[PDB]
Amino acid sequence: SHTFAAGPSLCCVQIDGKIIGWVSHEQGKIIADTLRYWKVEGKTPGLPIDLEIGYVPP
Amino acid sequence: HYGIQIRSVRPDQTSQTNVLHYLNDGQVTFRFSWRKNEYLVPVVMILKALCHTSDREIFDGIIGNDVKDSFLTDRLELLLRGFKKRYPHLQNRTQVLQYLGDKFRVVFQASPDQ
Amino acid sequence: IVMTASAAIKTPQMTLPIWNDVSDEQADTFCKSISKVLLSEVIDKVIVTETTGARSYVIHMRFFDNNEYSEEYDVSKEELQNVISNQFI
Amino acid sequence: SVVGSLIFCLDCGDLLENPNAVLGSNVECSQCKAIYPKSQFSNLKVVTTTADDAFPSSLRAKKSVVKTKEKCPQCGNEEMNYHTLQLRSADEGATVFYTCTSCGYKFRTNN
Amino acid sequence: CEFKLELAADTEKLLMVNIVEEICRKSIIRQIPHIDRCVHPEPENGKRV
Ligand SMILES: [Zn+2]
Ligand SMILES: [Zn+2]
Numbered sequence: 111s112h113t114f115a116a117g118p119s120l121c122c123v124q125i126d127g128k129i130i131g132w133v134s135h136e137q138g139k140i141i142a143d144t145l146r147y148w149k150v151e152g153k154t155p156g157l158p159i160d161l162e163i164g165y166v167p168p
Numbered sequence: 169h170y171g172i173q174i175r176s177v178r179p180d181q182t183s184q185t186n187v188l189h190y191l192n193d194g195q196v197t198f199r200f201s202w203r204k205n206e207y208l209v210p211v212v213m214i215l216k217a218l219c220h221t222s223d224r225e226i227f228d229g230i231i232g233n234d235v236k237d238s239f240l241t242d243r244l245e246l247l248l249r250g251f252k253k254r255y256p257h258l259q260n261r262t263q264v265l266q267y268l269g270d271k272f273r274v275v276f277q278a279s280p281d282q
Numbered sequence: 283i284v285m286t287a288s289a290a291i292k293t294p295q296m297t298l299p300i301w302n303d304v305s306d307e308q309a310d311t312f313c314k315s316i317s318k319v320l321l322s323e324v325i326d327k328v329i330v331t332e333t334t335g336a337r338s339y340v341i342h343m344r345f346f347d348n349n350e351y352s353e354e355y356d357v358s359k360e361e362l363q364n365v366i367s368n369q370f371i
Numbered sequence: 372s373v374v375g376s377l378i379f380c381l382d383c384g385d386l387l388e389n390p391n392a393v394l395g396s397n398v399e400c401s402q403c404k405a406i407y408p409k410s411q412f413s414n415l416k417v418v419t420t421t422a423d424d425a426f427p428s429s430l431r432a433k434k435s436v437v438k439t440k441e442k443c444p445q446c447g448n449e450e451m452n453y454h455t456l457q458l459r460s461a462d463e464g465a466t467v468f469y470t471c472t473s474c475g476y477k478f479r480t481n482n
Numbered sequence: 483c484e485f486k487l488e489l490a491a492d493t494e495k496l497l498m499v500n501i502v503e504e505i506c507r508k509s510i511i512r513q514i515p516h517i518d519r520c521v522h523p524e525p526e527n528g529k530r531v
Binding site: 320322323324325326327328329330331332333334335336337346350351354355 | 416417418419421423431434
């Protein structure tokens with residue numbers, strides 16, 4: 111809602127085809143490694159093991 | 169030969185593709201198919217029909233902080249001025265959306281009440 | 283060959299018999315004089331510059347160094363000027 | 372509001388007209404219909420270098436290439452399978468997840 | 483090689499790089515007609531080819 115961002119210089123975070131937000135290429139790999147670490151360690155109550163997290167690096 | 173293509177599915181698991189084409193003139197084209205024939209719409213007609221937009225907010229949604237990228241700025245000159253050239257009317261959202269309903273009324277099998 | 287008998291052949295060639303007099307050095311500087319040289323093959327980059335408000339353009343086509351393409355394509359400095367003068371524009 | 376070769380309104384953000392196709396001394400918007408004078412719109416300069424790969428040649432290809440242990444305490448093993456992984460942010464240290472093969476004991480390391 | 487190129491103010495925007503690139507690939511410095519390349523291969527079966 112308040113991002114002012116576009117283009118390949120960022121990585122666009124999308125869930126099921128809608129923009130959730132925008133974050134850096136370096137941070138967008140860091141926040142894609144927790145989303146695998148917390149989906150496998152089934153203690154976070156919002157992340158299923160069924161989830162597919164596709165990080166396309168720059 | 170360029171273009172982009174999404175296959176959007178509905179929550180009842182029924183699909184609808186929305187192919188965007190790139191024209192060598194500089195403008196782009198939204199393509200869909202309601203029945204077994206295809207239909208072509210310029211996307212600025214749809215960018216101004218989805219929500220109440222400015223014309224810098226169409227610019228700021230493609231151009232991020234890379235204003236100095238003069239490839240993108242020249243191709244977006246031709247996209248937004250081609251909408252003003254071909255459609256000198258249709259200035260706000262409620263007027264673009266009546267043009268889009270007048271052209272797709274007999275093909276979408278609309279009702280006389282709407 | 284057989285089925286279509288195409289005069290618009292896909293990849294035509296032509297075999298040329300080198301004489302015994304001309305050596306391998308006189309034959310490969312010879313094939314640089316037959317093979318075509320595009321203007322695209324000599325340009326490093328082209329920097330246009332448009333200032334409007336009469337729409338102006340500053341077409342600045344930057345080549346490689348003269349020691350680099352007069353060896354590679356056997357194109358002289360003055361012959362490259364005549365292509366821009368009489369053919370490119 | 373002047374970016375590149377295009378000018379916008381300062382009220383509704385609508386793309387203004389090209390000042391070299393309007394009657395003189397005034398550029399007018401189409402929605403707010405604000406008054407922008409044709410002055411102080413002086414340098415609409417835009418440079419566009421070519422596509423950097425637009426001209427394939429045998430010469431362009433030449434200038435590109437001529438440029439020139441852990442000691443696991445459970446049973447004792449030095450070859451121990453590890454994998455560093457930065458979890459939450461770049462502020463903290465990278466967690467090194469250790470996994471043995473001679474015994475199979477696993478542990479991690481903050482620092 | 484730099485050359486100025488003016489136009490009228492009535493005209494709208496041309497790209498003028500996709501134009502120049504397509505013209506630079508069609509302009510020829512030197513060409514024998516209907517021949518695009520001439521290769522000196524290795525001598526197959528004695529004769530010089
Ligand atoms: Zn305005
Ligand atoms: Zn061990």
